[PDB]
Symmetry: C3
């Protein structure tokens, strides 16, 4: 796209504020930002807020979101679809033109770990170029295992293809498949989907802890066989809904856009890889590390 | 196949009649019929009754089916395998020669949304050329959410490949991935697997309704990440068995031949896309629309 | 690999002995062994004990395993990762050099049907060359349906690619997808992953029996849509954990490394194919047979 040549819009923080006991304002951008998805490989991504996947959004069950998208792309329209919400797609996930803003309001009445993404046709093109992310909706009565959990993180799996190549998006194998982590609390890492950062800077934990991961595989195209090496998931809540309870899973199957809450114990010090067990994808990037130390610090 | 050149056998209605409180006769054909699977693209499909996927069959839990296949293909044998039934495959899903009929009897003792398909070797070839469909077996005690449901439809996902090309069937990406709808009640649409009909003629619903979809992904080869844009599934019954209950799913993972009953609320007027969230497949056809109006009519 | 030219190390039996009420010794080899994966097609596999998938391991919930790997490969390191165990991957699933042995100890505290595999980088390469298998951990209180089960077998699904070809492993479709059976009791078959043995020598059962299969899809790369023709699964326990109970499934979706216990009734004499319903994979080998006779014998 000629109007994207040389464009690299610096990342802009997510803006979010609570405006009532059940109402929350969120402001995001759509912007074009260079991201290093593998060493030496820059992808001029289509993004929310200069991150791909985009920034994490966390709301409470029953919150209505009053969402604004500011479209900083000079030529391509963008839009936002949160899988958390009940909305009219043709009214509420509509396009925002370049250099304009649009505001939409919709409720999040279901707990869980939901994908969000751009909804502009062709949606494959907008998702594959980087316009995906996760919104977590926290359950009003929590999860039955909340009191067991010592530490938590968010992980997202996505693919990257040949740059803005619709033939490859529809017909080709992914060039890279990658994990990123998005921060829940100050001091947590906040990374983009790349083949290396969570290997070189593992997530941290302490010996004996029960870890909860909020996970989503945003695709665009693959499913995920999510596994933490050296442990078994004690409890799994499919899509993060507390009712969809499984126990003792070695691997969690996630559809494209599928989410889960998974919990597992790390019994011994060491580094624990986190993979999709579709090992062609692991080989193409989708391995993150969890470093477990006697103190929980590096 | 030289004997299929120029053959286009007009569709023949499904014949079905109840012959006892727990016994039902069904008569289907195997026939060769041109179907427009994308605009300008005709596939000379191998079909049941001139439809691909084939006609919907609905029976009650505990019904024994006395099934007749009339093979109208001039040269290729065909057969029928219902995933609903308990049967001896080597006795009861055997081949019926060209211009012959065969009758088989077997019970449907499990509720759910089951694939049926031709079972003639190579089964990949017979399924990929179009010989797939769905049989629904209604549960004797219903589903716990029956009283919440306002409106229901049947959707089936399938792929189409290069015509009768066994190399492509085994080794190639699908050319098209498509939804069709099969009628439950008079006035419901009854369509074939194509990239366009359920976009141009959306399924209809009314604002505020709880919709139930009986879904199956018949493949042949892909899995499906089934999602309705702008809602969340309130309840999901995997394979349509009432015991396999999930709640609050954003997306339902279906294996090849996998079925489900899914239910969800449409809160606002508008058009709601229905996709597999494997977006390479959505892009290649697998998007249907649900138009939600204040009255439920167009 | 020049040092593998002409190498064909005869299979070595698994050695296992109980050394306390909750402790079990296991000794395996890593060795390079020719296996006929399709008629006329020899794959010089990387294996445990000269079998691919490797030998079956069965322990009880709560057993600690004291595992020794003897590496008979003349040049490549190997290692062992059991998905059953809680262990430190960087201490306990480490490499054993050629012509050396290594011993690791770790507990199996979760019931189910777990994949095991070599954990040496690149793990895709070691899994795809044949270093995968299953460990079953039997639940302390059994499964609720144990008393209904007449006969049981173990089935494993895997893929084979072009020989030791990392490009094909990461980017190519599988050349073959295959089932094997591993013996639970004397007289049960014990086979390797090939396109033909369980067609030519079906598993046996008797009319009217309830069959339990312990299944795992070890990949490396594909997911599996597991189906037995002519029946419906009465009960399914995902990953073999008794709590993850489903009923009346036509097809069980397994992630890569995913396991299950499935149970189903065979009502009539005949031969019952067992497939992944991803029919491109079935066509490339993944069909096993179950021959059901009036006596249970051939
Ligand atoms: Cu507001
Ligand atoms: Cu966009
Ligand atoms: Cu593993
Ligand atoms: Cu009759
Ligand atoms: Cu046929
Ligand atoms: Cu979506
Ligand atoms: Cu010992
Ligand atoms: Cu190895
Ligand atoms: Cu089938």
């Amino acid at each position: 796209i000629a109007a994207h040549k040389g464009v690299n819009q610096a990342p802009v923080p997510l803006k979010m504020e609570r405006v009532g006991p059940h109402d929350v304002h969120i402001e995001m951008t759509a912007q074009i930002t260079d991201i290093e998805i593998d060493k030496g490989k820059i992808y001029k991504a289509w993004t929310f807020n200069g991150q791909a996947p985009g920034p994490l959004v966390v709301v409470n069950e029953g919150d209505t979101i009053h969402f604004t998208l500011k479209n900083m792309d000079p030529v391509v329209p963008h839009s936002m679809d949160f899988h958390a919400v009940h909305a009219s797609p043709s009214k509420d996930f509509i396009d925002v033109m370049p250099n304009k803003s649009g505001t939409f309001t919709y409720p999040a009445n279901k707990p869980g770990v939901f994908m969000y993404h751009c909804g502009t046709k062709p949606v494959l093109q907008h998702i594959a170029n980087g316009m995906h992310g996760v919104i977590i909706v926290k359950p009003k009565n929590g999860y039955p295992t909340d009191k067991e959990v010592d530490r938590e993180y968010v992980l997202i799996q996505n693919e990257w293809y040949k740059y803005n190549d619709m033939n490859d998006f529809q017909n080709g194998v992914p060039s890279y498949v990658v994990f990123s982590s998005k921060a829940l609390k100050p001091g947590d890492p906040n990374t983009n989907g790349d083949t290396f950062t969570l290997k070189e800077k593992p997530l941290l934990a302490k010996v004996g802890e029960k870890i909860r991961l909020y996970i989503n595989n945003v695709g665009p195209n693959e499913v995920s066989s999510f596994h933490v090496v050296g442990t078994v998931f004690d409890d799994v809540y499919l899509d993060g809904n507390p009712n969809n309870h499984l126990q003792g899973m070695q691997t969690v199957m996630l559809p494209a856009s599928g989410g889960a809450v998974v919990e597992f114990t790390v019994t011994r010090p060491g580094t624990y890889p986190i993979v999709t067990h579709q090992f062609n994808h692991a080989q193409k990037g989708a391995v993150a590390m969890l470093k477990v130390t006697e103190t929980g610090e590096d």
